[PDB]
Amino acid sequence: TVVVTTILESPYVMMKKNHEMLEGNERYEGYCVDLAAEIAKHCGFKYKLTIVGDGKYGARDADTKIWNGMVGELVYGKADIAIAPLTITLVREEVIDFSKPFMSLGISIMIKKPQKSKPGVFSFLDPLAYEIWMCIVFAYIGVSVVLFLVSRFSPNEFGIFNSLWFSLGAFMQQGCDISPRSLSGRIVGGVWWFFTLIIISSYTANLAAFLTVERMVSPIESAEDLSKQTEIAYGTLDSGSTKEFFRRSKIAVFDKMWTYMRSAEPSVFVRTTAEGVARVRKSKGKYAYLLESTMNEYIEQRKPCDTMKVGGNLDSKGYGIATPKGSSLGTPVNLAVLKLSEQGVLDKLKNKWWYDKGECGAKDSGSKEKTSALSLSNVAGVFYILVGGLGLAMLVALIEFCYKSRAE
Amino acid sequence: TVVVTTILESPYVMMKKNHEMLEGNERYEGYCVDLAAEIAKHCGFKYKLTIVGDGKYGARDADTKIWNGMVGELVYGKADIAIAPLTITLVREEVIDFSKPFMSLGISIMIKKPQKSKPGVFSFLDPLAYEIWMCIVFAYIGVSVVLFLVSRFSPNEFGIFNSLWFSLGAFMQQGCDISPRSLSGRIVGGVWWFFTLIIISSYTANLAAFLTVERMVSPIESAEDLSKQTEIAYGTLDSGSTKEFFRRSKIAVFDKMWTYMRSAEPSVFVRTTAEGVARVRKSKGKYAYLLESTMNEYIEQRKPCDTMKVGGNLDSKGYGIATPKGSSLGTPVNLAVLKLSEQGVLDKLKNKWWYDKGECGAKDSGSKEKTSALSLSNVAGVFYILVGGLGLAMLVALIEFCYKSRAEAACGRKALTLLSSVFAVCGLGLLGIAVSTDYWLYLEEGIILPQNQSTEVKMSLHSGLWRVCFLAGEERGRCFTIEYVMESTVNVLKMIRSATPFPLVSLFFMFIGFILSNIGHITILAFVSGIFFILSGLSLVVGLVLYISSINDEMLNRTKDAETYFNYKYGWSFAFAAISFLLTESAGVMSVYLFMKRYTAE
Amino acid sequence: TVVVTTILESPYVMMKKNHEMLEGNERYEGYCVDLAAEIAKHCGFKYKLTIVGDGKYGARDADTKIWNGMVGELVYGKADIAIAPLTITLVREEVIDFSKPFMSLGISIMIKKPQKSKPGVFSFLDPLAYEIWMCIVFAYIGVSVVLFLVSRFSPNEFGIFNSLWFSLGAFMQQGCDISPRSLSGRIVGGVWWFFTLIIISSYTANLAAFLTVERMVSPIESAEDLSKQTEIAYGTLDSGSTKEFFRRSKIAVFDKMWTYMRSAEPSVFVRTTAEGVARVRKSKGKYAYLLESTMNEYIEQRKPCDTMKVGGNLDSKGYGIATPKGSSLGTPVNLAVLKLSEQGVLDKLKNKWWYDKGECGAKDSGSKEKTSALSLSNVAGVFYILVGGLGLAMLVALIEFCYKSRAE
Amino acid sequence: TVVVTTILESPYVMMKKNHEMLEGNERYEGYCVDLAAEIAKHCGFKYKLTIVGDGKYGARDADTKIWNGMVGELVYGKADIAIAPLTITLVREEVIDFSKPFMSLGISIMIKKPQKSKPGVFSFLDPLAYEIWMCIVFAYIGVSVVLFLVSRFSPNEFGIFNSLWFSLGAFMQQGCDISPRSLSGRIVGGVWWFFTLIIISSYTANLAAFLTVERMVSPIESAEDLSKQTEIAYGTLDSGSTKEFFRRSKIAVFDKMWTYMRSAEPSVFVRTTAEGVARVRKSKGKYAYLLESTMNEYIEQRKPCDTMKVGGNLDSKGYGIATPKGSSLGTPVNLAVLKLSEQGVLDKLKNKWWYDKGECGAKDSGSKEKTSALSLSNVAGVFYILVGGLGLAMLVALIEFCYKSRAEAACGRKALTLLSSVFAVCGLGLLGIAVSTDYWLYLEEGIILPQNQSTEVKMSLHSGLWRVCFLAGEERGRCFTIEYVMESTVNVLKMIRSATPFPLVSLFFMFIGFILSNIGHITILAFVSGIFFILSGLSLVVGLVLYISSINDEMLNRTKDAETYFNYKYGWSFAFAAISFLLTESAGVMSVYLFMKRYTAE
Numbered sequence A, C: 001t002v003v004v005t006t007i008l009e010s011p012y013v014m015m016k017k018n019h020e021m022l023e024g025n026e027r028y029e030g031y032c033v034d035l036a037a038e039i040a041k042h043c044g045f046k047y048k049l050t051i052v053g054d055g056k057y058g059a060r061d062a063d064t065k066i067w068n069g070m071v072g073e074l075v076y077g078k079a080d081i082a083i084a085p086l087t088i089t090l091v092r093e094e095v096i097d098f099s100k101p102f103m104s105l106g107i108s109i110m111i112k113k114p115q116k117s118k119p120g121v122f123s124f125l126d127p128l129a130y131e132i133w134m135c136i137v138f139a140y141i142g143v144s145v146v147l148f149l150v151s152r153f154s155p156n157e158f159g160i161f162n163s164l165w166f167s168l169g170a171f172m173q174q175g176c177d178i179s180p181r182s183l184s185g186r187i188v189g190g191v192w193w194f195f196t197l198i199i200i201s202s203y204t205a206n207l208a209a210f211l212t213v214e215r216m217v218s219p220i221e222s223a224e225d226l227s228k229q230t231e232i233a234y235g236t237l238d239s240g241s242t243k244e245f246f247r248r249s250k251i252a253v254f255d256k257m258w259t260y261m262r263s264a265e266p267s268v269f270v271r272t273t274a275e276g277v278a279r280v281r282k283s284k285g286k287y288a289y290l291l292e293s294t295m296n297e298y299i300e301q302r303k304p305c306d307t308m309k310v311g312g313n314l315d316s317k318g319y320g321i322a323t324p325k326g327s328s329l330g331t332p333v334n335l336a337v338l339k340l341s342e343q344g345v346l347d348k349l350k351n352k353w354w355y356d357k358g359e360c361g362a363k364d365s366g367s368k369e370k371t372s373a374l375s376l377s378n379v380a381g382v383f384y385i386l387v388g389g390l391g392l393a394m395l396v397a398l399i400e401f402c403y404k405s406r407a408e
Numbered sequence B, D: 001t002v003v004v005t006t007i008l009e010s011p012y013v014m015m016k017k018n019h020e021m022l023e024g025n026e027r028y029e030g031y032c033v034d035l036a037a038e039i040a041k042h043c044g045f046k047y048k049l050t051i052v053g054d055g056k057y058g059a060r061d062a063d064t065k066i067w068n069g070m071v072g073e074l075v076y077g078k079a080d081i082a083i084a085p086l087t088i089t090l091v092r093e094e095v096i097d098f099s100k101p102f103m104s105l106g107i108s109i110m111i112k113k114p115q116k117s118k119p120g121v122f123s124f125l126d127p128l129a130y131e132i133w134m135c136i137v138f139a140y141i142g143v144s145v146v147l148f149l150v151s152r153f154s155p156n157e158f159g160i161f162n163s164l165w166f167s168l169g170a171f172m173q174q175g176c177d178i179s180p181r182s183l184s185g186r187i188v189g190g191v192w193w194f195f196t197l198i199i200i201s202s203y204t205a206n207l208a209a210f211l212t213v214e215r216m217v218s219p220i221e222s223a224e225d226l227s228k229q230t231e232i233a234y235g236t237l238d239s240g241s242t243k244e245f246f247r248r249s250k251i252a253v254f255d256k257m258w259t260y261m262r263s264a265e266p267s268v269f270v271r272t273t274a275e276g277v278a279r280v281r282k283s284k285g286k287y288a289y290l291l292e293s294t295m296n297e298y299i300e301q302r303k304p305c306d307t308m309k310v311g312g313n314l315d316s317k318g319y320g321i322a323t324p325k326g327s328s329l330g331t332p333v334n335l336a337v338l339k340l341s342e343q344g345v346l347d348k349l350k351n352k353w354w355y356d357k358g359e360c361g362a363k364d365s366g367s368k369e370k371t372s373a374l375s376l377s378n379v380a381g382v383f384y385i386l387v388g389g390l391g392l393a394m395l396v397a398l399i400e401f402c403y404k405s406r407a408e409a410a411c412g413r414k415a416l417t418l419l420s421s422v423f424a425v426c427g428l429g430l431l432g433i434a435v436s437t438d439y440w441l442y443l444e445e446g447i448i449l450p451q452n453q454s455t456e457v458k459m460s461l462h463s464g465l466w467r468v469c470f471l472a473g474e475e476r477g478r479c480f481t482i483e484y485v486m487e488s489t490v491n492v493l494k495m496i497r498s499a500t501p502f503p504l505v506s507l508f509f510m511f512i513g514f515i516l517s518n519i520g521h522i523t524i525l526a527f528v529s530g531i532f533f534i535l536s537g538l539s540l541v542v543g544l545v546l547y548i549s550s551i552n553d554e555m556l557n558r559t560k561d562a563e564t565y566f567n568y569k570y571g572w573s574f575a576f577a578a579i580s581f582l583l584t585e586s587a588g589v590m591s592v593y594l595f596m597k598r599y600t601a602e
Ligand SMILES: N[C@@H](CCC(=O)O)C(=O)O
Pocket: B057, B058, B085, B086, B087, B237, B239, B240, B241, B242, B243, B244, B291, B292
């Protein structure tokens, strides 16, 4: 009777393992398969699912005007009914009819879900801000300055070269041989002692908080951070909606997109959705793939779990049944679309099929971690400051010999 | 002239600075106001603006269901063309006509922006209690006093200035100058070391306890977190489409929302958006609100800058020009909707009203590098104590320079002999005052009232250890002894009785020690009396620790109910005990000053 | 037509506020009210809900044989049908008939849900076991013993009285004036230094773990811990099942119960279920109340939240509709009971009514806490060891003077 | 004779030590075996025992549904009276007859008992990495070497034995003896203090990180926790009533269980209880099991003592004597069920078989005082290093006593002059060996196989910095240079190139320093050559830190997949570099020994 045109994409149309073994009509399973079983039943018709041989979404060719992938089977009459995840757009509706939307979707960003980021060489000073480290320095100066001035007007081992050394080890938790032996002096060392005792305890407590609780970094989100960050390479699928909708960029943010989307190398587009899944997993911070929302949702729910949806829908779009213009069975479908939507067969099977394939959620966030031993990379910059301090130490040893030899 | 109805909504429909000066259609301003002209210019007509008499979009009840809002205005022929931020839904679709959606939108959560709140200028001392910080100082005094008494015995560099200084560096773990070379001095030096070992580690662990719990605070955003959390109230605008959206939903997390917003109390359904704006502002993040993204974006662009969006857009509806079933001119509108979209005149204006209000100054752009590193305001008071310690040391450096020069250019003895004995009098006097009062402490039990409403004290009283005289408990003036009963305060008053003897032990020794100081004026008389001043003060500290910690026992032992607030405080007789403590600790050393002075005379 | 006998107990039969204002038949609401509306509908009959005037579960009187509370209305014929939360037992079934059970329940223990327990005076040494504190002591001894023996055979400020003082401050993180000046000596101080540096860091890390993560204590559970602990006072309701089922104690654990249950003071029983709710909330560790399971479940789900179910069912029991022996409508109910159970109206309304009244669960466990400042009670015993060390210090000062004065 | 069928189940039906010697009904033993006699004595009959040919209780399929198990045995008249732990349910009720339940029971969870597992004898050093502990020692050496070179210059108590000792106490924060009184000595003393300040605090915070996460581990027990957690697999006995219970359930947490156990792979449904006992024992708590309480209690009373019950009983069924529809003698059974319950003969036996097996020794009674305080086995190795440090110090105390006495009763110089120069040879030799090899490290990438199955190494290789010679990567013997490519290991090999110059800087200085040591044998020749030994060793440590940390970079940079296991290791040329490091650091000081010796000669 009727000819079904569609394409195999998860979770819509999915081949199982044993399609060579047993076919029946169960070569393909999914939400879109059973929704086609609903819409054929409510119309009464019986289907022949024929996925297109070229295997593309498709559009009419630029300057050649030939409908490519599923639009070729739908316009040129070799297929009639189309239960397919295809975008309703203007030039889509211009040549052939569509039904009501399956669901409310839009363009979503797919990034790699990051692992533990690499700390820098100076990541040891992470619990304290630059201002606090700087305020310690001027405090370290001013205390020994005061101790120099306190020891000036009272009868003397406390030179300006000496009082630096006392206040340093007091900050470094080390005891010193010479102690103040004056009331005004011992006030200054005491408040300096009570200073550092807070600070060392403060640095220890914040550092445990970084180790125990971990916060995850999302460098790019909400599509404005995409517009500023131009080290990420955007990706979409061509021969379809995301190509032309950004080719029809009119918002100033989308203009900054499409100028950069044309000026990119080499992945201005890709040609397979599963490739754009694989390419982001190989990209690792350099590249991103914009696509349909519920696809990015679903691939996140299939568990390699290294993916993430950020931001939100950049458009409002809907999946409707494509029918040729002046369809034999369009208005039969149009009523039977309303028969699905009136009680939510569109809702209820989508309730089932979206949670069906397993979940990637708060299951692995809770108790799939152990804190590790500290890497050398955590504490590496301490050694470079150490050996760099060792390198500077030998240099002062040489220039000591020069000014000592000028006692001639 | 065609009738155009609108609702007052920013930036769609605005007022005017010439609010009553100005005339006609020009009297208002806004995005759709220009879009009304865009239909008017493209089709070539004049329009007559009106306002909805209700002030709501559309309501439909289990009723004759005549629509309360802009729908029934347009239904009953009162309106001709409706130009509004109106949601295109199926229930509206069957009764009126929409054009193509000229705007894309979603359900959005608006909350109070979690702001940088006030830190403490003394936030560093928060992991310990101020009771403990007071007891540390009291421990710091007496140990130095005991060590001096141990060291400077009758037949050694450990002066009282040294013993203060040695105990300080031992507490600060910064080493020391010298060590005690006598067994009892090594006894007191050891027990001070085990003291300071715990307390420093006690402070460090609780400081990490503040920080780790703070990072384990997770800002709820995903709307499933909002669904599971009854601490945050969430409500919607009534008579809209958001209210209708959660009504007929088949998402299980939406169903619990609509169930919870059904059974809520008080009514979370708010008549106008501006009050739903306001109820978020009043609750300080206790209450949350659900609305469309575009309004939630625009209020974010305004400059109180205290409202932000969390989570993602729940669905994708649209705003469309509304016409009744049978409008002839709504089809050239459907021409004009497509053409101005293809011309981008929509996007010309939908840019225009939105990027214009950068009057918030992009507070989100410069305040989302949030790291859990400390700020200076976390540790500000430590620098204050530092430089405040410096200026005192500068002041001592000045007054040393004067006083040393004047002395170099017997008279001290009989004055300090008079000073030391009168120090015992004020110590004996302040303990005599403190015991007799019924004002050693404070106690207050009441219930709080939730919504911006003053607290109600159920029962209140001042008390001492002997007698209890109520203040607002039945407004009853019974100076009522504890042996006569009168429910958790009853158990408080019984535990006060356990702290009885150590103040009474204290009073006996000082009266002996003071009267033996006068007989010393009439030697060993002065010598042992200083020990009675110290043995009193040891019973003071044990008396204070029993007093304070047993209150802290029954503090937590109160059944914690959220409405039952609590306050307590110590009284002036508590402060009278501490002042009387220091003088006996000081003048007891001054006996050892005078005894070693008089042993030189002997 | 029919006379309904029952009693008002939450969540079964519950008066609202405005029962004086509006009655209709909605004076009483609950699961048991609507289940009575189900069983009257499936039978066809129409009800008159009459809660008994005495207001008791009841039984026949010991040595007097008069049915007391609801058994009086059911046996003596003034009431016919009984949709009531009443236990099916032998002597219950002996005189009048019952239906199939509403649900599978049993005897459950109701304890107070404890708050933060009071720490002891010696709770500061909680992160380290008694063995570890003891092993430090013998380590503290043996190191100074070795240092005494090391300093013996090598040329001497290290007496046995001295080497205790060095190794102590090294354990107490304090620097000492005299250091070892021999290779075999400096090995011992070095490994002693590396000893304590682990230990102080170990004590700090465990103490933060006690403060950050809190574990809740359940002193009594699983009904064997009830059988050993005899500081808790058990409570049940008399004139009913829990009285006689423990009066029919045959298990050796229940014998230890019922010997103690008879030998108790004063609450051998109480007479109101809500009193047993209130009495445990006033008991605070001294007393417990055994009762029906789904009651203890429900009162836990009503939120004062200071209650807890521990252990499990100590019996298997069921709620059946009481009917007089040779009932007019028993077999009509018996089929209509099966009409409820065949599709789970018994299940589905119990699904609704049990989650209906609000929840007390993981909602307050997660984020309704802040760690407080340390109390003085946390650190009190440090002061008593301190002042007790101060008390012992003065005593050695006196006995020093005695042996000094014997230089005569 | 009446036919009595049973299933083999402890302690209901047991085998015999006279397994083939013994005859008839006596051939087995058990609880119901005695209860079979209790019916037999009370009614007055003989019985004929049989065993079910299937080995299961009862199965009912979408089928002709003839019951596979003890039901269809009793259905088809093969059995007369069934005495078994059989569940009384409605589906069984309509087809056969039950008496009153003689036992009360519930669904129970049996898991592997979470046991006291093995701690580490070196568990203390776990918050840091052994890479770091090696680098701390290497830092501890060279800083002492640098400080000595700084101190003992050409024109002071800081000997090399002191500089080792001063650096130790500074690292242990236990104070020091004296301080450097020269600016470059204060420079090196300061930077060592800032070194040890971080590392100690770094160790303490990560030690708390192990402990807090361990307490945040919550043992899942409530069966809702089990329902949400896919890490623990949970399955039931098939052809029973537990399988039928979750099938027709209207509790939403039960529905997810039955859904999850539907869609599971492999089959969690287990034919016999003893294999369901065993699959828990094999998985080591990865797999869980659902059964009745009474069996779960009895296996707990047995003595492997590794099985415990968590949570509560989900329902309340009963065990009842099963008779077909139409059994005449099942009604005197219903007499005998009531009478022996009223006589407590049931409770006589139901006590008897249960309290008898106290052969576990009540392990639950003495092992549930679990507190998060440390054990000795947590910190055992620290006592080992302590006493192991003592016995070495005792050994030095002996060999000091001999060597000092013999010396007291020029010859040292020319020997140590020979020792010092040959120390440079072995240092130059071991660096010459280490660079040329392709064995500096180890690398291995493979996938693991889940169920007790050996790991599969996908690709493996040994390598150096210059060349890479594979081992099991295609089993290919290419000593393949890194400039020729060949996916994460590719990025490993590129980062190895960044660590190139500092070993090459190292080799140049030692060859200069050694050949200048020989020309010193042919002064300042020996003096500056020691600095070239030290400046080499500084480039060693920077060379090692670049080498180690960049591996740790690409260690974590591997995409963590649960099947992809990983191992890496360093090679002997890595250990050859460390041995060559110490000799040049030692003999460089020995140049300063010999120079100050020869400056005395000069
Ligand atoms: N645009 C919405 C506003 C009210 C709502 O969000 O429910 C409407 O007209 O229905």
